[PDB]
Homo-oligomer: A and B are copies of this chain.
Amino acid sequence: DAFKITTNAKAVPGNYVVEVNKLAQAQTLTTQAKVSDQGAKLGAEGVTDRSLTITAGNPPKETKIPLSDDQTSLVELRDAINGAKAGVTASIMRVGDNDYQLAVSSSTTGENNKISLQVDNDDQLGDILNYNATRGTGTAMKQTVAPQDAELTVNGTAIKRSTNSISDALQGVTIDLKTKTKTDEPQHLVIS
């Protein structure tokens, strides 16, 4: 139940027990500013050198993208971010009528697959999107899902990995994680 197994000729037939303690997660950052209209421009008027720099991936890569005034609505920011292929994906959460938030999620899972966002030349948009090591008030960009590694034990040996597809721990075996195992309840595996 907690995982799928695939094997090749290198797998050793035998008795295995597996515990799954944590699944790898992609960090998510979500806007917190009150936005009643996902098509309304949120940036300052008349800026010709606005950009957004996204740092993401492992190793971290920085992508800088220009944004016209028209691209400062949630919908257009989402489109610009997705089109940039910057190691993140963007989607809009309609929390309720007149209440929209933009969620930026790492394209890759893992503890070290974190995100920073920095707006240049638009402090007003910066107050909505900027995200780095420190956070000062309630309406700034906020982490809503933590970056996390997968953590499992195979025959009692603890393994940590950046993804939920573990192909480089046991030769000939790939363990694709689906859920945690129950707390005092290792799952049994026979390879034959």
Contacts and interface: CB of A to CB of B under 8 A. Distances in A.
A185 B179 CA distance: 8
Contacts of A26: 14-15
Contact of A15 (B94, B106, B156): B106
Interface string A71-92: 0000000100010000001111
A174 interface: no
A143 B155 CA distance: 10
B107 A154 contact: no
A103 B14 CA distance: 11
Contacts of A23: 188
A107 B30 contact: no
Given A170-B93, A179-B185, A185-B179, A17 B12 contact: no
B30 A157 contact: yes
A30 B145 CA distance: 35
Contacts of A96: 160
Which 9 pairs from chain A and chain B are nearest by CB? A144-B156, A14-B89, A15-B26, A28-B155, A12-B91, A145-B156, A93-B157, A145-B155, A103-B155
